[PDB]
Design a protein around this nucleic acid. Structure first.
Ligand SMILES: [Mg+2]
Ligand SMILES: [Mg+2]
Ligand SMILES: [Mg+2]
Ligand SMILES: [Mg+2]
Ligand SMILES: [Mg+2]
Ligand SMILES: [Mg+2]
Ligand SMILES: [Mg+2]
Ligand SMILES: [Mg+2]
Ligand SMILES: [Mg+2]
Ligand SMILES: [Mg+2]
Ligand SMILES: [Mg+2]
Ligand SMILES: [Mg+2]
Ligand SMILES: [Mg+2]
Ligand SMILES: [Mg+2]
Ligand SMILES: [Mg+2]
Ligand SMILES: [Mg+2]
Ligand SMILES: [Mg+2]
Ligand SMILES: [Mg+2]
Ligand SMILES: [Mg+2]
Ligand SMILES: [Mg+2]
Ligand SMILES: [Mg+2]
Ligand SMILES: [Mg+2]
Ligand SMILES: [Mg+2]
Ligand SMILES: [Mg+2]
Ligand SMILES: [Mg+2]
Ligand SMILES: [Mg+2]
Ligand SMILES: [Mg+2]
Ligand SMILES: [Mg+2]
Ligand SMILES: [Mg+2]
Ligand SMILES: [Mg+2]
Ligand SMILES: [Mg+2]
Ligand SMILES: [Mg+2]
Ligand SMILES: [Mg+2]
Ligand SMILES: [Mg+2]
Ligand SMILES: [Mg+2]
Ligand SMILES: [Mg+2]
Ligand SMILES: [Mg+2]
Ligand SMILES: [Mg+2]
Ligand SMILES: [Mg+2]
Ligand SMILES: [Mg+2]
Ligand SMILES: [Mg+2]
Ligand SMILES: [Mg+2]
Ligand SMILES: [Mg+2]
Ligand SMILES: [Mg+2]
Ligand SMILES: [Mg+2]
Ligand SMILES: [Mg+2]
Ligand SMILES: [Mg+2]
Ligand SMILES: [Mg+2]
Ligand SMILES: [Mg+2]
Ligand SMILES: [Mg+2]
Ligand SMILES: [Mg+2]
Ligand SMILES: [Mg+2]
Ligand SMILES: [Mg+2]
Ligand SMILES: [Mg+2]
Ligand SMILES: [Mg+2]
Ligand SMILES: [Mg+2]
Ligand SMILES: [Mg+2]
Ligand SMILES: [Mg+2]
Ligand SMILES: [Mg+2]
Ligand SMILES: [Mg+2]
Ligand SMILES: [Mg+2]
Ligand SMILES: [Mg+2]
Ligand SMILES: [Mg+2]
Ligand SMILES: [Mg+2]
Ligand SMILES: [Mg+2]
Ligand SMILES: [Mg+2]
Ligand SMILES: [Mg+2]
Ligand SMILES: [Mg+2]
Ligand SMILES: [Mg+2]
Ligand SMILES: [Mg+2]
Ligand SMILES: [Mg+2]
Ligand SMILES: [Mg+2]
Ligand SMILES: [Mg+2]
Ligand SMILES: [Mg+2]
Ligand SMILES: [Mg+2]
Ligand SMILES: [Mg+2]
Ligand SMILES: [Mg+2]
Ligand SMILES: [Mg+2]
Ligand SMILES: [Mg+2]
Ligand SMILES: [Mg+2]
Ligand SMILES: [Mg+2]
Ligand SMILES: [Mg+2]
Ligand SMILES: [Mg+2]
Ligand SMILES: [Mg+2]
Ligand SMILES: [Mg+2]
Ligand SMILES: [Mg+2]
Ligand SMILES: [Mg+2]
Ligand SMILES: [Mg+2]
Ligand SMILES: [Mg+2]
Ligand SMILES: [Mg+2]
Ligand SMILES: [Mg+2]
Ligand SMILES: [Mg+2]
Ligand SMILES: [Mg+2]
Ligand SMILES: [Mg+2]
Ligand SMILES: [Mg+2]
Ligand SMILES: [Mg+2]
Ligand SMILES: [Mg+2]
Ligand SMILES: [Mg+2]
Ligand SMILES: [Mg+2]
Ligand SMILES: [Mg+2]
Ligand SMILES: [Mg+2]
Ligand SMILES: [Mg+2]
Ligand SMILES: [Mg+2]
Ligand SMILES: [Mg+2]
Ligand SMILES: [Mg+2]
Ligand SMILES: [Mg+2]
Ligand SMILES: [Mg+2]
Ligand SMILES: [Mg+2]
Ligand SMILES: [Mg+2]
Ligand SMILES: [Mg+2]
Ligand SMILES: [Mg+2]
Ligand SMILES: [Mg+2]
Ligand SMILES: [Mg+2]
Ligand SMILES: [Mg+2]
Ligand SMILES: [Mg+2]
Ligand SMILES: [Mg+2]
Ligand SMILES: [Mg+2]
Ligand SMILES: [Mg+2]
Ligand SMILES: [Mg+2]
Ligand SMILES: [Mg+2]
Ligand SMILES: [Mg+2]
Ligand SMILES: [Mg+2]
Ligand SMILES: [Mg+2]
Ligand SMILES: [Mg+2]
Ligand SMILES: [Mg+2]
Ligand SMILES: [Mg+2]
Ligand SMILES: [Mg+2]
Ligand SMILES: [Mg+2]
Ligand SMILES: [Mg+2]
Ligand SMILES: [Mg+2]
Ligand SMILES: [Mg+2]
Ligand SMILES: [Mg+2]
Ligand SMILES: [Mg+2]
Ligand SMILES: [Mg+2]
Ligand SMILES: [Mg+2]
Ligand SMILES: [Mg+2]
Ligand SMILES: [Mg+2]
Ligand SMILES: [Mg+2]
Ligand SMILES: [Mg+2]
Ligand SMILES: [Mg+2]
Ligand SMILES: [Mg+2]
Ligand SMILES: [Mg+2]
Ligand SMILES: [Mg+2]
Ligand SMILES: [Mg+2]
Ligand SMILES: [Mg+2]
Ligand SMILES: [Mg+2]
Ligand SMILES: [Mg+2]
Ligand SMILES: [Mg+2]
Ligand SMILES: [Mg+2]
Ligand SMILES: [Mg+2]
Ligand SMILES: [Mg+2]
Ligand SMILES: [Mg+2]
Ligand SMILES: [Mg+2]
Ligand SMILES: [Mg+2]
Ligand SMILES: [Mg+2]
Ligand SMILES: [Mg+2]
Ligand SMILES: [Mg+2]
Ligand SMILES: [Mg+2]
Ligand SMILES: [Mg+2]
Ligand SMILES: [Mg+2]
Ligand SMILES: [Mg+2]
Ligand SMILES: [Mg+2]
Ligand SMILES: [Mg+2]
Ligand SMILES: [Mg+2]
Ligand SMILES: [Mg+2]
Ligand SMILES: [Mg+2]
Ligand SMILES: [Mg+2]
Ligand SMILES: [Mg+2]
Ligand SMILES: [Mg+2]
Ligand SMILES: [Mg+2]
Ligand SMILES: [Mg+2]
Ligand SMILES: [Mg+2]
Ligand SMILES: [Mg+2]
Ligand SMILES: [Mg+2]
Ligand SMILES: [Mg+2]
Ligand SMILES: [Mg+2]
Ligand SMILES: [Mg+2]
Ligand SMILES: [Mg+2]
Ligand SMILES: [Mg+2]
Ligand SMILES: [Mg+2]
Ligand SMILES: [Mg+2]
Ligand SMILES: [Mg+2]
Ligand SMILES: [Mg+2]
Ligand SMILES: [Mg+2]
Ligand SMILES: [Mg+2]
Ligand SMILES: [Mg+2]
Ligand SMILES: [Mg+2]
Ligand SMILES: [Mg+2]
Ligand SMILES: [Mg+2]
Ligand SMILES: [Mg+2]
Ligand SMILES: [Mg+2]
Ligand SMILES: [Mg+2]
Ligand SMILES: [Mg+2]
Ligand SMILES: [Mg+2]
Ligand SMILES: [Mg+2]
Ligand SMILES: [Mg+2]
Ligand SMILES: [Mg+2]
Ligand SMILES: [Mg+2]
Ligand SMILES: [Mg+2]
Ligand SMILES: [Mg+2]
Ligand SMILES: [Mg+2]
Ligand SMILES: [Mg+2]
Ligand SMILES: [Mg+2]
Ligand SMILES: [Mg+2]
Ligand SMILES: [Mg+2]
Ligand SMILES: [Mg+2]
Ligand SMILES: [Mg+2]
Ligand SMILES: [Mg+2]
Ligand SMILES: [Mg+2]
Ligand SMILES: [Mg+2]
Ligand SMILES: [Mg+2]
Ligand SMILES: [Mg+2]
Ligand SMILES: [Mg+2]
Ligand SMILES: [Mg+2]
Ligand SMILES: [Mg+2]
Ligand SMILES: [Mg+2]
Ligand SMILES: [Mg+2]
Ligand SMILES: [Mg+2]
Ligand SMILES: [Mg+2]
Ligand SMILES: [Mg+2]
Ligand SMILES: [Zn+2]
Lengths: 141, 154, 59, 53, 110, 83
RNA sequence: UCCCCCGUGCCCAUAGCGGCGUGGAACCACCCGUUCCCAUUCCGAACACGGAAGUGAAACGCGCCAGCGCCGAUGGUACUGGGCGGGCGACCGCCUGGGAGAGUAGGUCGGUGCGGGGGA
RNA sequence: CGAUCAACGGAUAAAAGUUACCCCGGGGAUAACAGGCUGAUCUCCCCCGAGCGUCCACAGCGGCGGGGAGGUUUGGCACCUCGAUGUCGGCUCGUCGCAUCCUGGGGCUGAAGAAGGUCCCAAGGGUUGGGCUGUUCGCCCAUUAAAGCGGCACGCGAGCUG
RNA sequence: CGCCUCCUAAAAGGUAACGGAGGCGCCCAAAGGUCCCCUCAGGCGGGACGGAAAUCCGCCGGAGAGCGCAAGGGUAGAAGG
RNA sequence: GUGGAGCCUGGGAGUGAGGGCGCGAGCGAUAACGUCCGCGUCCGAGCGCGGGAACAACCGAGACCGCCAGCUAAGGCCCCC
């Protein structure tokens, strides 16, 4: 599963989640993409689940681009503890994801293969999504 | 190549009022002019999807001028995935840099070219996974110069 | 010219700098009208509480 | 200060009065310190010698 | 990229200009030696001298002392007495020293 | 009522705030000795009629008016202009 | 007053890197020497002194070039002081004032003060 | 000059434990019961359709992930109550919810019949006697149409038990 | 449990939690004063033993080295040698 | 800018359990009528008044007394009203 190999600091303060995505809003590599409509902390498990779903639909074929990376350490205290006594341990990693971000792209595949694969992937995601196709607006960026 | 697009001058209309009015705020510039313009949004959409920064669009400003432009920038509203501003580069004889498509006989869909507006080609043809060549070995029709370092993989 | 200023909305619940602005202008009670000079420094306090107040240009 | 870095007084060698307080590392600097310093009593500069504090 | 020459010249000039005095700046070529007393607050040279202007020749050192007296002579005329010596990139020695000794001999205060 | 044992944090220390920064701004009247800038290193440099103490503190040498000057690659200086 | 050079400032790369061209009468440099002053953790390389046969090769000065560097609009956007709404929220929207960063067009192979030598 | 007066503005020069034999002054400023808020955990219900099911994604299943509901678990928080809101279980007496254990009505079935599986509707009524343990629960015995799950201050000690 | 550095800290200062990370309880007789001089790391090419790295030479290199020890600030027009 | 403004000297205090809400963060689980700070507000002390079915802190608004007079604010105008 994805996660940083090394890190300066083990624990980050919690995000804010305002504003449209900072970058990565245009299709950059493949033909079709999957776009976030709402903000969220997308976990590494969600990503890995959306990715495998698109592989088993492409039956090992095509290309898959994952343009979000879970770099934000996610912390949780052990069950039933009281508050305080310092920050909980790192239990996972999320990628901050805001409306307009292209999270995944595909190519090497028919339009029907890609639209379905991207549809299945969005069901693995804790947010609403939208499938896009590489336009000239994309190539002008 | 090539296309035509009605374009009207603006001065103090709010871009929000124009956008709400189904139009696209824009600007027109070169070494000699700078004008605030607006195109009708739906009209621009059907031209740019075909013309797409590679091909010439002639703007028909109401004052009779037909200025030949290349789209040089399109800022999008990242939430809605809708264009919200256009930079029309008024073409005149001086040599410009632009992106020319590549059609093969596949990394780069196009390539950056230094050319005179007269010599603006439609194609740059290529040849015959996993193998690849570089822009060094490339066609270069009359008037066009590889506007990168040939270290680029294609 | 001068500015006739009517306080038509209560400062209660608004920040203290806005309450102080009303005091600089001498507006103490609701519906109170005051005609002050149209100077830039009086105008700055009128604009500060413009959501509380109704302004008219006079003479 | 420490066991090897000891405090010490500087005694005017001409009127015997201790005039300054300082330190040294007695391992790095075993010899007694000798430094010219102004003596307020002799109202003049004079050789000063380390003594035990 | 600075050379040791430029680093030296900045190093001594920075220290002089902190004191606020008029700067007796000395430049020494392989043939000639030049002096000009400088106001760094106004950016104006107040008085100058040189073997090239005085058309002197002979022993470079003996000539260096001469421009020193010549620079002093004209300096006292305009009221300038106190001054700070600027050896720039030069060691305080020989030709520069002789010009320095000359200026004092003529009455400049440094 | 079960109460789960808790560990502890190895952190929780911070040092006193040092109140650093500029103490007299451009155009203010100051007296010789007035502190002008508290700083670590030479974030600002002593200009005309300004001294610098062992902890880089900038202070006025004459009565007068503070002036700032941004000399680019030469650095930011604080001056005191005589009255 | 104008051109060249020398010295010294100021703006702090629109002033830099690189490529090229150019200058020795004067000025500057290299250079000729190492007796003398002075000098090398060794070295006359440096620092220094005494010189004037040579060369602008190096350095420096002046030009031309936009490859790199550096500067950089306009327009649009983000954000936001103040004023208002919306959503269970995560968060979003309006009015008014302010308004980036990136990027596009484009610009740049410096500009200027004071003194000195020379020239017309 | 003599301070790990380091509990570092440093009570004495000089100091540890225990109390279920305990006492008083106070606190719901603060824990344990119950409630409340929350819902991580808990119980239940959905979305996706990778696979299983000889064949066949969906009879019966549902990888990896996603969305909720409920408020019976453990808790989190500490808001009424410490000038007292008695605290487990049982017995007695009910009453309610339905996410239904049985009985009634259905659809689908990998439904021949009989018997089952799964889901839908349905809370009218019913939902046994014992062995063990304080037990709740659970396991066991013998039956049964069935031997349901939860709420009512873990319903009910000015009703009993202890 | 006192002290230092960074963040949290909302572009003056200050700002909390059993919030996120480190350090101090020394040291130096020069590692102090002043004067004079010098300029790093690293990259590449060259050189017996000699290596990734000893010392030597050339070129490039504005500071990414160094400044006793944490961190931050500062700094070669020196605070570094 | 003449205000229950400000500055100086002195007498008398009380307070050193806050709370809700908006915004900004940390802790928590992008939980809590949760906790901890920052800016602001209100309740506290305005449990006086109107609106919000009822309701400290949401909206409206700062109650000196009297009137069987008029205008408005939020919010309302089918009946309870
Ligand atoms: Mg947080
Ligand atoms: Mg961020
Ligand atoms: Mg999560
Ligand atoms: Mg977390
Ligand atoms: Mg945690
Ligand atoms: Mg904690
Ligand atoms: Mg994003
Ligand atoms: Mg989804
Ligand atoms: Mg489509
Ligand atoms: Mg599109
Ligand atoms: Mg971009
Ligand atoms: Mg037409
Ligand atoms: Mg469109
Ligand atoms: Mg381009
Ligand atoms: Mg109001
Ligand atoms: Mg209000
Ligand atoms: Mg209001
Ligand atoms: Mg308000
Ligand atoms: Mg307001
Ligand atoms: Mg204010
Ligand atoms: Mg009133
Ligand atoms: Mg009134
Ligand atoms: Mg204001
Ligand atoms: Mg010592
Ligand atoms: Mg005495
Ligand atoms: Mg001793
Ligand atoms: Mg002579
Ligand atoms: Mg001479
Ligand atoms: Mg000099
Ligand atoms: Mg409990
Ligand atoms: Mg508990
Ligand atoms: Mg319990
Ligand atoms: Mg610890
Ligand atoms: Mg703290
Ligand atoms: Mg502090
Ligand atoms: Mg603090
Ligand atoms: Mg701090
Ligand atoms: Mg400051
Ligand atoms: Mg000092
Ligand atoms: Mg100024
Ligand atoms: Mg000045
Ligand atoms: Mg003249
Ligand atoms: Mg020059
Ligand atoms: Mg000049
Ligand atoms: Mg070149
Ligand atoms: Mg030549
Ligand atoms: Mg040249
Ligand atoms: Mg010559
Ligand atoms: Mg010649
Ligand atoms: Mg000799
Ligand atoms: Mg040359
Ligand atoms: Mg360029
Ligand atoms: Mg800039
Ligand atoms: Mg820019
Ligand atoms: Mg702008
Ligand atoms: Mg926006
Ligand atoms: Mg705004
Ligand atoms: Mg703000
Ligand atoms: Mg403000
Ligand atoms: Mg706002
Ligand atoms: Mg709301
Ligand atoms: Mg939610
Ligand atoms: Mg907004
Ligand atoms: Mg917005
Ligand atoms: Mg705005
Ligand atoms: Mg605006
Ligand atoms: Mg900009
Ligand atoms: Mg533009
Ligand atoms: Mg360009
Ligand atoms: Mg350009
Ligand atoms: Mg040019
Ligand atoms: Mg240039
Ligand atoms: Mg020029
Ligand atoms: Mg110049
Ligand atoms: Mg000047
Ligand atoms: Mg001149
Ligand atoms: Mg002349
Ligand atoms: Mg001249
Ligand atoms: Mg102790
Ligand atoms: Mg003690
Ligand atoms: Mg203590
Ligand atoms: Mg203290
Ligand atoms: Mg004691
Ligand atoms: Mg004792
Ligand atoms: Mg004790
Ligand atoms: Mg014991
Ligand atoms: Mg006892
Ligand atoms: Mg006992
Ligand atoms: Mg007891
Ligand atoms: Mg006993
Ligand atoms: Mg007894
Ligand atoms: Mg007894
Ligand atoms: Mg007793
Ligand atoms: Mg007793
Ligand atoms: Mg008792
Ligand atoms: Mg008793
Ligand atoms: Mg008692
Ligand atoms: Mg009592
Ligand atoms: Mg009490
Ligand atoms: Mg309580
Ligand atoms: Mg307490
Ligand atoms: Mg209480
Ligand atoms: Mg309790
Ligand atoms: Mg309890
Ligand atoms: Mg309790
Ligand atoms: Mg109870
Ligand atoms: Mg409880
Ligand atoms: Mg209760
Ligand atoms: Mg809930
Ligand atoms: Mg729930
Ligand atoms: Mg849950
Ligand atoms: Mg459901
Ligand atoms: Mg199969
Ligand atoms: Mg089947
Ligand atoms: Mg599952
Ligand atoms: Mg969920
Ligand atoms: Mg839920
Ligand atoms: Mg769930
Ligand atoms: Mg409950
Ligand atoms: Mg409960
Ligand atoms: Mg509920
Ligand atoms: Mg338990
Ligand atoms: Mg509970
Ligand atoms: Mg509390
Ligand atoms: Mg109690
Ligand atoms: Mg009682
Ligand atoms: Mg009672
Ligand atoms: Mg009682
Ligand atoms: Mg009672
Ligand atoms: Mg019985
Ligand atoms: Mg029951
Ligand atoms: Mg049912
Ligand atoms: Mg049945
Ligand atoms: Mg049936
Ligand atoms: Mg059935
Ligand atoms: Mg059968
Ligand atoms: Mg049957
Ligand atoms: Mg069914
Ligand atoms: Mg029933
Ligand atoms: Mg029943
Ligand atoms: Mg028996
Ligand atoms: Mg029994
Ligand atoms: Mg039992
Ligand atoms: Mg049991
Ligand atoms: Mg049975
Ligand atoms: Mg049966
Ligand atoms: Mg039984
Ligand atoms: Mg029950
Ligand atoms: Mg029951
Ligand atoms: Mg209950
Ligand atoms: Mg319970
Ligand atoms: Mg129980
Ligand atoms: Mg219990
Ligand atoms: Mg009970
Ligand atoms: Mg009971
Ligand atoms: Mg009883
Ligand atoms: Mg009982
Ligand atoms: Mg009872
Ligand atoms: Mg009772
Ligand atoms: Mg009772
Ligand atoms: Mg008993
Ligand atoms: Mg303390
Ligand atoms: Mg301490
Ligand atoms: Mg601050
Ligand atoms: Mg800070
Ligand atoms: Mg202060
Ligand atoms: Mg506090
Ligand atoms: Mg730590
Ligand atoms: Mg420690
Ligand atoms: Mg010594
Ligand atoms: Mg040191
Ligand atoms: Mg020394
Ligand atoms: Mg080698
Ligand atoms: Mg070697
Ligand atoms: Mg080191
Ligand atoms: Mg260390
Ligand atoms: Mg450094
Ligand atoms: Mg008052
Ligand atoms: Mg008062
Ligand atoms: Mg007062
Ligand atoms: Mg006061
Ligand atoms: Mg007073
Ligand atoms: Mg007083
Ligand atoms: Mg009294
Ligand atoms: Mg008190
Ligand atoms: Mg207290
Ligand atoms: Mg308060
Ligand atoms: Mg508080
Ligand atoms: Mg508190
Ligand atoms: Mg609160
Ligand atoms: Mg309340
Ligand atoms: Mg709140
Ligand atoms: Mg709000
Ligand atoms: Mg924070
Ligand atoms: Mg949750
Ligand atoms: Mg609270
Ligand atoms: Mg809250
Ligand atoms: Mg909170
Ligand atoms: Mg508050
Ligand atoms: Mg109120
Ligand atoms: Mg009330
Ligand atoms: Mg009440
Ligand atoms: Mg009250
Ligand atoms: Mg009310
Ligand atoms: Mg009401
Ligand atoms: Mg209500
Ligand atoms: Mg209420
Ligand atoms: Mg009230
Ligand atoms: Mg309110
Ligand atoms: Mg309102
Ligand atoms: Mg009021
Ligand atoms: Mg009143
Ligand atoms: Mg009232
Ligand atoms: Mg009144
Ligand atoms: Mg009316
Ligand atoms: Mg109304
Ligand atoms: Mg009605
Ligand atoms: Mg009624
Ligand atoms: Mg009614
Ligand atoms: Mg009516
Ligand atoms: Zn003595």
């Amino acid at each position: 599963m994805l996660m940083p190999r090394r890190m300066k600091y083990r624990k980050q303060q919690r995000g804010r989640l305002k504003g449209a995505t900072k970058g990565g809003d245009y299709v950059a590599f493949g033909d079709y993409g999957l776009v976030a409509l709402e903000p969220a902390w997308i976990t590494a498990q969600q990503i890995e689940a959306a990715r495998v779903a698109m592989v088993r639909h492409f039956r090992r074929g095509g290309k898959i681009f994952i343009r979000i990376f879970p770099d934000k350490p996610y912390t949780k205290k052990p069950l039933e503890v009281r508050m305080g006594k310092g920050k909980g341990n790192v239990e996972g990693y999320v990628a901050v994801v805001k409306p307009g971000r292209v999270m995944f792209e595909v190519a090497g595949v028919t339009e029907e293969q890609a639209m379905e694969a991207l549809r299945i992937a969005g069901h693995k995601l804790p947010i609403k999504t939208k499938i896009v196709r590489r336009d000239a607006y994309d190539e002008a960026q | 190549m090539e296309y035509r697009l009605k374009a009207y001058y603006r001065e103090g209309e709010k871009p929000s009022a124009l956008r709400r009015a189904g139009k696209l705020p824009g600007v027109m510039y070169n070494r000699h002019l700078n004008r605030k313009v607006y195109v009708d949004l739906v009209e621009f959409d059907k031209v740019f999807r075909q013309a797409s920064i590679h091909h010439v669009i002639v703007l028909e400003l109401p004052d009779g001028q037909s200025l030949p432009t290349l789209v040089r920038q399109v800022n999008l509203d990242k939430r809605r995935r809708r264009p919200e501003h256009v930079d029309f580069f008024v073409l005149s004889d001086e040599p410009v840099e632009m992106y020319v498509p590549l059609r093969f006989v596949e990394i780069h869909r196009d390539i950056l070219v230094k050319v005179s507006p007269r010599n603006i080609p439609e194609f740059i043809e290529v040849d015959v996974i996993g193998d690849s060549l570089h822009a060094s070995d490339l066609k270069l029709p009359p008037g066009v110069e590889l506007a990168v370092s040939p270290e680029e993989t294609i | 010219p001068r500015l006739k200023v009517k306080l038509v909305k209560s400062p209660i619940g608004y920040p203290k700098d806005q309450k102080a602005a009303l005091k600089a202008l001498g507006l103490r009670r609701l519906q109170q009208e005051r005609v002050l000079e149209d100077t830039p420094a009086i105008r700055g306090n009128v604009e500060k509480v413009a959501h509380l107040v109704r302004v008219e240009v006079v003479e | 200060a420490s066991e090897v870095r000891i405090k010490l007084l500087l005694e005017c060698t001409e009127c015997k009065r201790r005039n300054y307080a300082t330190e040294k590392n007695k391992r790095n600097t075993p010899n007694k310190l000798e430094l010219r310093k102004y003596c307020p009593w002799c109202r003049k500069h004079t050789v000063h010698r380390e003594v035990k504090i | 990229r600075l050379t040791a020459y430029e680093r030296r010249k900045f190093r001594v000039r920075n220290r002089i200009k902190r004191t606020g005095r008029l700067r007796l700046s000395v430049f020494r070529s392989l043939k000639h030696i030049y002096a000009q007393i400088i106001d760094d607050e106004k950016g104006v040279t107040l008085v100058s001298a040189s073997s090239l202007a005085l058309k002197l020749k002979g022993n470079k050192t003996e000539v260096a002392r001469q421009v020193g007296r010549a620079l002093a002579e004209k300096a006292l005329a305009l009221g300038i007495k106190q001054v700070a010596f600027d050896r720039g990139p030069y060691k305080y020695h020989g030709r520069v020293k002789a010009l320095a000794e000359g200026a004092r001999e003529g009455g400049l205060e440094f | 009522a079960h109460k789960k044992g808790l560990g502890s944090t190895r952190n929780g220390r911070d040092s006193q705030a040092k109140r650093l920064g500029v103490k007299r701004y451009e155009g203010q009247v100051v007296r010789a000795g007035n502190i002008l800038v508290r700083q670590r290193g030479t974030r600002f440099k002593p200009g005309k009629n300004v001294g610098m103490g062992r902890d880089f503190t900038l202070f006025a040498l004459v009565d007068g008016v503070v002036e700032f000057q941004d000399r680019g690659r030469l650095g930011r200086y604080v001056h005191v202009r005589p009255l």
